[PDB]
Design a protein around this ligand. Sequence first.
Ligand SMILES: Nc1nc2c(ncn2[C@@H]2O[C@H](COP(=O)(O)OP(=O)(O)OP(=O)(O)O)[C@@H](O)[C@H]2O)c(=O)[nH]1
Ligand SMILES: Nc1nc2c(ncn2[C@@H]2O[C@H](COP(=O)(O)OP(=O)(O)O)[C@@H](O)[C@H]2O)c(=O)[nH]1
Ligand SMILES: [Ca+2]
Ligand SMILES: [Ca+2]
Ligand SMILES: [Mg+2]
Ligand SMILES: [Mg+2]
Lengths: 440, 422
Amino acid sequence: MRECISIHVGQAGVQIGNACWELYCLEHGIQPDGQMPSDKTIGGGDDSFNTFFSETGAGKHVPRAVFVDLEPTVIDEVRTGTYRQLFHPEQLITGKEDAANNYARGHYTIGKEIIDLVLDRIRKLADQCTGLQGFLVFHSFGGGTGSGFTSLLMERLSVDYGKKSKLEFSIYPAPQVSTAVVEPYNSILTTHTTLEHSDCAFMVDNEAIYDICRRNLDIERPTYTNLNRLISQIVSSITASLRFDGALNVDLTEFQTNLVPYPRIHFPLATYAPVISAEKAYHEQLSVAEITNACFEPANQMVKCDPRHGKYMACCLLYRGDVVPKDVNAAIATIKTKRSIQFVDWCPTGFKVGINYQPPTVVPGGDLAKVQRAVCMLSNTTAIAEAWARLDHKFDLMYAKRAFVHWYVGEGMEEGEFSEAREDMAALEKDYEEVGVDSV
Amino acid sequence: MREIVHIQAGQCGNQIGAKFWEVISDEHGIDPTGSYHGDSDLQLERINVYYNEATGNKYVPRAILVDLEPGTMDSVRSGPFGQIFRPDNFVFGQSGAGNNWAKGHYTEGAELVDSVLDVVRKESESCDCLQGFQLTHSLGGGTGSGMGTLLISKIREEYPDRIMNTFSVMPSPKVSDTVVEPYNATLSVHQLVENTDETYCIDNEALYDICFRTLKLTTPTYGDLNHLVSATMSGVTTCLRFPGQLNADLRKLAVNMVPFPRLHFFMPGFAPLTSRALTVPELTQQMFDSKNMMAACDPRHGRYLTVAAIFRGRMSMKEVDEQMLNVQNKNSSYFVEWIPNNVKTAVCDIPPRGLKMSATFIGNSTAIQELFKRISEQFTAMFRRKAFLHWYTGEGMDEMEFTEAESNMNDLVSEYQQYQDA
Ligand SMILES: Nc1nc2c(ncn2[C@@H]2O[C@H](COP(=O)(O)OP(=O)(O)OP(=O)(O)O)[C@@H](O)[C@H]2O)c(=O)[nH]1
Ligand SMILES: Nc1nc2c(ncn2[C@@H]2O[C@H](COP(=O)(O)OP(=O)(O)O)[C@@H](O)[C@H]2O)c(=O)[nH]1
Ligand SMILES: [Ca+2]
Ligand SMILES: [Ca+2]
Ligand SMILES: [Mg+2]
Ligand SMILES: [Mg+2]
């Protein structure tokens, strides 16, 4: 009961998937062959970790996950790497030819050829669930598969699973590690087509993660591996309430009630602390107050924007590790007596808190210090729309001259789809302005 | 007028309900296995009001446990007295209600309610003469609030001539789970105004303040809140549970407490407040003190329509009568003059566990309007921008139903104000 199915789409989706599932395994005591000695009920159970792992009679704990990509070389690494026994082969699905950084090929030309198979395999996961809660979909905005195949899949999932919850982890593009000039097109197309099919979406700005790696972990030139390890800690923090139990534990769905005041306003800002090197963490114990303080430092946000220049509609603090409410409450009181935390006039200002007692883990050979306590803040702030503004502007620059548009038109798309997607984005930025204006 | 059927719904409802059964079972000498081991016959004389007698001189709570998810009732069943409850009286779904009144009332709850009523009917069927029902629940969540009020409606339809009584926990931002609590509470209050005879307004605002200000609890937990609630619940049911003259059943209580049918929302109070010797004068002063009230309303801001006072322990009845008269005679302005002799007092020899003596206060005060005004303000701050409504319209509700619930709760407020000035 309460199963969650993860779907990792395209390179970014898949590689972030690798990092998350490795991390989950370590958090839960699951070996790379899928065995979990601590689990005494063989071949099934209703433990909290079962929301993310099914079990075979032979004692294997198998991620409720599908990996999909239109070319094979990234998933081939999963097939042949360290956690290859973790996954049944049918959970890892590949085409022969990718979307070539083109939303149209991901959604139509190439995507249409593998979509029924993907849904077949997701259906196989669903049928093993006694109370499926919904899906978590991981993907880039910028890639052809991450953008166009994800959109197609989300549209088909609404049809096939009705209103079952769909949450995204969406990788927003940064010039430091982007690989296509047309990513702004792909980002707007997929955001427009997915918007009505997603209940909640956590954007991860590659530039924010890149900066955090450079600045807080002293990594000269971060690789995807560096980025993904940090992303996985954040993803882990958000899903921990689903995977562990606890008296002070608060379900992600409960935070969602507070995070989403209107269906379209469904993009929380995540902020994570502490991100600190082993070198800096040694003999330096960061207190509940210190990590909570860090949540209101914009440098620690997963999306670049300035909440101090916007308005809050919700603030949620998801703690893990050695943390009790007394200390949280005191930390919050201080922060209120000293910060630019302004709420819209129609929302209560109380911070919503959950605590999972299981301490954070790190992957061997990684950059993050192992710490006793960590926190992820999820806020609903009007400032997140800055990310849409930056992207919409880049789209406008190119689209005005119709730069690269022939690549999409050649794959069957119409200019009408571009203008329609861009207008939806204009309306979304307007939605974020409106919700911040005072009541009359 | 003998048997009461108890129902507890949703997380809050079940947690406070479980504590209520633990507490009164101890008071009546019933151990966790339903065996009696007391030393007084006062304990068993009216035990049938709350317990069925099974085989082997076993006593079984006449209690039905309801939820739309299993979690809290798994905990109840694991709880100290969890084995005393009748296993078939645990009725639960798997879906949860997501703090959503619409889910509890119209969709998820709809699917489960019939099976609850099958159990209620089986309970009522063995009653020699059912008085009515008591429901424990919160108003801020989904199951206790939305499904709890659905139940009350269906129960009324099936037992329209029986008394409906609730212990209803009112939400507060100070002790809040979600932002939609004001919505769920306003929707529920309209149900309560129409379909209960007597409602104890238990305000999480008041409970928190008492824990913080008075009991010196820096960081009050729901458990600390529930200590106060279970102590209060024991107090207000003393007259139903032990031999006595006044308010000895639910209908006579309603007749003594409710001068106009809609105005049936009571502010409870308790003394001494607990987390070694109290005089009758001190009990009396503390029981009437705003700081001892479980609804966060200033009783000097309104008037008392009716009051019931219950004193427990060995003490001078002469002194009790003197002190109760002294309260009325020295603060006579706060008691409406158009209901003569509107304060009734009971005394019960058995004190609650851990105290030599105690007092419980049940007030029907026009000041209760402050609690509804507070909910009404919170409701409106959001509803004016239709904020968070999609959670409800997604379950098939429309805005008009919100407008109506709001109007009826504002009507209730205006009605208290009317008798405050009369
Ligand atoms: N954080 C992070 N970003 C990634 C990773 N891999 C690719 N990206 C980003 O994702 C975007 C490119 O999309 P991809 O996921 O590689 O492409 P795809 O979904 O496989 O689509 P096609 O190759 O066109 O079929 C760029 O913005 C990259 O910087 C990764 O492992 N981690
Ligand atoms: N006093 C008290 N209040 C509670 C408890 N549990 C939840 N609440 C309150 O009840 C409301 C949440 O509703 P809840 O009963 O948990 O949801 P439900 O299971 O859908 O009925 C909020 O106002 C909480 O503050 C409890 O054990 N004691
Ligand atoms: Ca197991
Ligand atoms: Ca169902
Ligand atoms: Mg690719
Ligand atoms: Mg709850």
